[PDB]
Amino acid sequence: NDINAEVVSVSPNKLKISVDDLEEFKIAEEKLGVGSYLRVSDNQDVALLAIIDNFSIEVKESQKQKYMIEASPIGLVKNGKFYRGGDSLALPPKKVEPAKLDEIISIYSDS
Amino acid sequence: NDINAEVVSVSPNKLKISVDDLEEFKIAEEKLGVGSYLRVSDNQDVALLAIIDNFSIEVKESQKQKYMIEASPIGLVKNGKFYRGGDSLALPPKKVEPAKLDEIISIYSDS
Amino acid sequence: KSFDDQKKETIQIIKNHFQCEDYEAEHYLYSNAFRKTYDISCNKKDRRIKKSDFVESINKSKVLFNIWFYQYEGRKEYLRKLKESFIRRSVNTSPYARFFILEFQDKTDIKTVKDCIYKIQSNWSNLSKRTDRPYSPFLLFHGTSDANLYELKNQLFNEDLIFTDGYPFKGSVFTPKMLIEGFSNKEIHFQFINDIDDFNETLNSINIRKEVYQFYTENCLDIPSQLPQVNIQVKDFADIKEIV
Amino acid sequence: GRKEYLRKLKESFIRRSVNTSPYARFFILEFQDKTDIKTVKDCIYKIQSNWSNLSKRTDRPYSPFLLFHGTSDANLYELKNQLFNEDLIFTDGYPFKGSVFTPKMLIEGFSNKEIHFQFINDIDDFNETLNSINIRKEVYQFYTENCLDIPSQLPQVNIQVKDFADIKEIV
Amino acid sequence: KDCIYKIQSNWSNLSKRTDRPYSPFLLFHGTSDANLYELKNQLFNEDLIFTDGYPFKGSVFTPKMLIEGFSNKEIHFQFINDIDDFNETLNSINIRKEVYQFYTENCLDIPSQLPQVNIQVKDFADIKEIV
Numbered sequence: 192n193d194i195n196a197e198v199v200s201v202s203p204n205k206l207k208i209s210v211d212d213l214e215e216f217k218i219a220e221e222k223l224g225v226g227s228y229l230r231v232s233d234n235q236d237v238a239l240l241a242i243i244d245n246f247s248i249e250v251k252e253s254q255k256q257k258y259m260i261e262a263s264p265i266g267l268v269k270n271g272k273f274y275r276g277g278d279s280l281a282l283p284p285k286k287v288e289p290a291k292l293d294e295i296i297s298i299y300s301d302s
Numbered sequence: 303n304d305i306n307a308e309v310v311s312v313s314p315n316k317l318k319i320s321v322d323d324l325e326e327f328k329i330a331e332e333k334l335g336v337g338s339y340l341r342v343s344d345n346q347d348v349a350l351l352a353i354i355d356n357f358s359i360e361v362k363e364s365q366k367q368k369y370m371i372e373a374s375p376i377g378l379v380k381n382g383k384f385y386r387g388g389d390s391l392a393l394p395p396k397k398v399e400p401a402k403l404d405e406i407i408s409i410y411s412d413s
Numbered sequence: 414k415s416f417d418d419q420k421k422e423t424i425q426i427i428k429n430h431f432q433c434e435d436y437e438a439e440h441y442l443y444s445n446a447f448r449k450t451y452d453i454s455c456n457k458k459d460r461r462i463k464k465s466d467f468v469e470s471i472n473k474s475k476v477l478f479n480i481w482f483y484q485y486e487g488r489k490e491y492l493r494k495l496k497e498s499f500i501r502r503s504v505n506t507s508p509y510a511r512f513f514i515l516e517f518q519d520k521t522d523i524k525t526v527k528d529c530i531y532k533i534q535s536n537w538s539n540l541s542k543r544t545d546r547p548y549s550p551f552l553l554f555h556g557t558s559d560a561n562l563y564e565l566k567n568q569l570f571n572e573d574l575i576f577t578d579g580y581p582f583k584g585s586v587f588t589p590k591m592l593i594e595g596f597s598n599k600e601i602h603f604q605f606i607n608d609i610d611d612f613n614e615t616l617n618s619i620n621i622r623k624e625v626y627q628f629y630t631e632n633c634l635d636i637p638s639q640l641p642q643v644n645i646q647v648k649d650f651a652d653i654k655e656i657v
Numbered sequence: 658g659r660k661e662y663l664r665k666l667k668e669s670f671i672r673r674s675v676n677t678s679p680y681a682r683f684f685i686l687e688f689q690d691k692t693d694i695k696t697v698k699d700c701i702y703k704i705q706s707n708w709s710n711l712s713k714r715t716d717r718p719y720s721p722f723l724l725f726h727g728t729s730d731a732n733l734y735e736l737k738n739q740l741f742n743e744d745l746i747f748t749d750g751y752p753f754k755g756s757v758f759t760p761k762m763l764i765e766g767f768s769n770k771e772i773h774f775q776f777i778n779d780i781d782d783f784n785e786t787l788n789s790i791n792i793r794k795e796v797y798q799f800y801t802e803n804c805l806d807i808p809s810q811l812p813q814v815n816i817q818v819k820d821f822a823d824i825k826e827i828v
Numbered sequence: 829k830d831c832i833y834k835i836q837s838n839w840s841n842l843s844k845r846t847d848r849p850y851s852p853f854l855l856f857h858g859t860s861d862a863n864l865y866e867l868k869n870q871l872f873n874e875d876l877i878f879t880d881g882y883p884f885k886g887s888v889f890t891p892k893m894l895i896e897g898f899s900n901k902e903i904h905f906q907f908i909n910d911i912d913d914f915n916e917t918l919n920s921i922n923i924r925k926e927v928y929q930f931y932t933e934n935c936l937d938i939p940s941q942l943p944q945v946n947i948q949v950k951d952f953a954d955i956k957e958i959v
Contacts, residue, residue: 213393216507220391225314248312250394250543308541322542345536347502378504381497393505395543563755570752570759580754583778584734585741607754699943702924743924 194218196260196287198231204277206231206241208287210258219258222289228298229262230290231281237269239281240290240298260287266298273297305329307371307398309342312391317342317352319398321369330369333400339409340373341401342392349379350392351401351409371398377409384408431472440498445470445477475633478646492655499643500626500656508548509622510596511537512606513657514636516629517557521650523565526554529654530569530603536657540599547599551592551615552576553606556632566605578605579615587611589618609634616640628653662819666827670814671797679719681767681794682708683783684828687803688728692821694736697725701740703825704774711770718770722763722786723747724777727803737776749776750786758782760789780805787811799824831956832871835905838959842901849901853894853917854878855908857936868907880907881917889913891920911936918942930955 193215200207208229213219221227225243232238241262249257264281267274273294306323319340324330332338336354343349352373360368375388384405427446428438449470453462476499483491513533517526530552537550554562569576577595579587587607592615595601606612616623616637625636627644636642647653675682684704688697701723708721725733740747748766750759763786766772777783787794787808796813798805801820807813818824832854839852856864871878879897881889894917897903908914918925918939927944929935932951938944949955 216393216503216505219393220503220505224389224391246314248394250310250545252542255545256394308543310543343504344506344539345502347496347500347536348504350504380502381493390504395539395541397539397541559755566753566755567757570756576753578753581741581752582737582747582749582776583751584730585738588741605753695941695943698924742922744922745924 194223194288196229198281198283198285198287201281201283204263205244206239206260206262206264206281208260208262210260213258218289223260228290228295229260230268230288230294231262231264231285233286237267238294239264239279239285240266240268240273240294268294268297271297273301275302305334305399307340307369309392309394309396309398312394315374315388316355317373317375317392319371319373321371324367324369329400334371339401339406340371341379341399341405342373342375342396344396347381349405350375350388350390350396351377351379351384351405352388379405379408382408384412386413430468436498440494441476442471444479444482445473445475447479447481448477451481474636474638474642475644476646478648483648488652488655492652495645495656499645506537506539506548507622508539508546509624510548510551510619512551512553512612512623512625513537514553514555514625514627514629514634515650515653516632517554517562517565517650518630519557519561521557523561523568525649525651526565527568529650529657530574532654533657534574534603538603540602542599544599547597549596549598549601549603551596551604551606553608553612555608555634562607574602575600576603576605577601578607579611580607587614589615593618613637626657628656663823663826666816666818666823670816671827675795677710679710679717679792681722681790681792682719683722683724683777683794683796684708685724685726685796685798685800685805685807686821686824687798687800687805688725688733688736689801689821690728690732692728694732694739696822696825697736698739700821700825700828701774702745704828705745707828709773711773713770718768720767720769720772720774722767722775722777724779724783726779726805733778745773746771747774747776748772749778750782751778758785760786764789784808797828799827829867829870831952831959832867832905833876834956835959836876840905842904844901849899851898851900851903851905853898853906853908855914855936857910858934864909876904877902878905878907879903880909881913889916891917895920915939928959930958 192212194210195212196208196210198206199209210219210223223243223246225246227243229241229243230238231241241264243260243262245261247257247259264279265275265277267276267279303323304326305321307319307321309317310320311318321334334354334357336357338354340352340354341349342352352375354371354373356372358370375390375392377388378385378390382404424439424443427442431438431442449467453460476495515529533550533552538548540547540549554565566578577591579589579591581588581591592604592606595604606615623640625640625642627633627636627642628647629644630647630650633644645656686697686700704721704723709719711718711720748762750762752759752762763775766775777786794811796807796811798807798813798815799818800815801818804815816827818827835852835854840850842849842851868880879893881891881893883890883893894906897906908917925942927938927942929938929944929946930949931946932949935946947958949958
């Protein structure tokens with residue numbers, strides 16, 4: 192697993208995402224940016240799509256690093272078709288991966 | 303090693319740098335002041351430039367001296383060429399040294 | 414023709430032939446084909462040969478030294494030309510098992526070898542106390558006597574450059590797992606692979622992404638091909654410091 | 658009875674704990690060609706368990722020093738190889754191949770909780786680490802036929818044993 | 829079962845305070861497989877959880893399961909079926925091994941590189957008080 196990110200807190204328009212394990216180091220550089228798109232799901236078929244609002248990486252001597260990501264659930268994708276939502280509830284914990292190109296394109300094309 | 307500073311936390315526009323060891327007192331006096339330029343990298347080829355925004359040195363009775371520096375990334379130096387735009391992500395921890403004169407000159411000459 | 418009038422024509426005839434990138438043709442295939450053109454041209458008797466086997470001789474993984482582009486732009490530009498071609502770097506260096514095979518012979522001074530070890534360890538290791546994934550490079554030296562090699566290892570230990578080599582005590586068999594622990598050890602600065610037999614046993618014990626950086630002057634080895642190799646020929650061992 | 662000979666030797670020279678103080682304890686065991694490898698290992702494990710304090714609660718840790726003599730280097734190195742595979746981590750001042758004797762590696766391993774004991778290869782490394790340790794050093798000798806010569810300025814006991822097996826319950 | 833429970837109670841330490849746990853290894857010989865599986869089934873019913881290197885039906889012998897079960901606080905001891913499972917387990921263990929043999933008539937053959945002790949008892953009932 193190249194990235195192990197996970198939603199840890201859910202607010203009505205906010206997601207708090209913890210990157211538990213980062214391995215590629217290129218996912219964080221390009222796909223975890225301040226405007227990047229994430230896919231939030233526990234299954235490959237139906238997902239939330241979120242834009243990163245904020246992030247914070249912290250390292251300390253003894254404990255593990257705290258890479259924390261703020262995101263906002265802009266919509267819902269079901270079976271390749273994106274539905275502009277903003278209120279669909281994801282119950283944490285939820286597996287988070289960077290959104291694919293076809294999913295980001297589906298935001299502005301399926302409406 | 304005269305200066306031992308390291309990035310301990312990363313925000314989208316902010317770096318927190320902890321000075322672990324300060325053998326040379328002259329480096330802190332003239333190169334670690336507010337507005338000074340730092341070179342943030344784990345290697346000498348590709349780096350991230352930052353400007354010191356704030357600092358605080360707190361000393362206590364029994365523990366080690368806590369020298370913390372706030373910086374904001376301003377651009378990226380690759381093979382002696384500076385690229386404006388501090389949206390690149392440096393994964394902490396990253397070794398921090400004061401920037402050389404050629405690096406500060408390349409901020410305005412290259413762009 | 415002129416010197417510049419033939420540069421942009423020689424690259425394109427091998428760029429489309431091998432279907433590679435720009436650094437894989439100008440720095441990797443143009444450079445090797447220049448001396449193999451010069452080697453048959455500088456021969457006393459056999460000047461004209463057939464180029465049927467010329468296309469496979471230049472396709473070797475070794476990046477060959479070229480003397481004509483050493484006296485032309487100097488050592489400050491040729492070593493700077495090799496640095497962004499195969500020693501490409503990013504902002505964040507990933508915890509990979511990087512292997513640095515440097516060639517050490519009897520005329521090379523120990524001190525000049527010692528400065529390259531300090532250069533390799535500084536750039537290719539992150540031994541920070543706040544890392545959850547520290548990494549250190551592996552170092553292999555060859556072509557020298559064991560007595561001359563042991564003097565280098567003995568000096569590095571006195572200047573507090575702690576390393577591991579798979580032999581924690583006298584009479585110990587070579588333990589690969591000592592080198593793997595030294596990769597993740599923040600108190601071990603690098604790993605010293607003694608010889609080829611200790612080399613290939615360490616590749617099988619590593620499951621993470623592996624990179625090999627070989628720098629030599631005349632003698633090169635047969636690194637297995639599924640790895641990434643970088644094989645660069647230099648004149649003197651001090652040229653290796655400016656590339657890594 | 659054989660229980661009485663062990664009881665006399667356990668109290669005459671050896672003490673049960675020697676106040677559990679951090680001391681440079683040297684255990685010189687006379688290894689023969691006739692002595693089996695595994696009965697040396699039982700003696701080493703018993704010496705290490707009784708004469709070291711590597712718990713995290715302490716602030717003054719210590720580890721014993723082991724020296725063997727009378728045997729060849731073939732089975733001496735073979736014993737050291739087995740002890741390393743069973744996670745009994747030791748040091749002998751030779752951190753790498755083709756290294757000179759580094760007595761400071763034995764100094765750090767004495768205070769290291771991850772290094773269980775300190776091995777000493779022979780006499781020349783034994784006298785070299787004697788001058789490198791500044792704290793109080795005691796030498797315990799367990800021999801059957803051949804007795805080593807110890808410098809006269811150190812607290813030494815010399816215990817004769819019928820074989821190598823009875824050394825284990827003495828310590 | 830009374831002997832196995834006494835061996836597990838004395839020669840294992842699975843308390844949450846420690847960080848170096850250990851569990852004993854149990855091997856039986858001279859009996860049929862019918863009452864060997866009857867003994868294994870009854871011990872697992874009373875929450876004396878063990879591993880024998882066969883985590884599922886039709887599995888090859890996995891000594892890694894006994895590596896994890898030795899340091900697992902939730903696995904009380906380890907079962908060994910016969911001599912072929914025992915020798916392969918010895919090679920997989922890297923730490924110090926001791927073989928404690930209790931027998932009445934027939935004694936099993938043990939490799940000489942291991943510390944062995946042999947106890948000949950009048951019957952099986954004396955083993956629970958000896959151990």
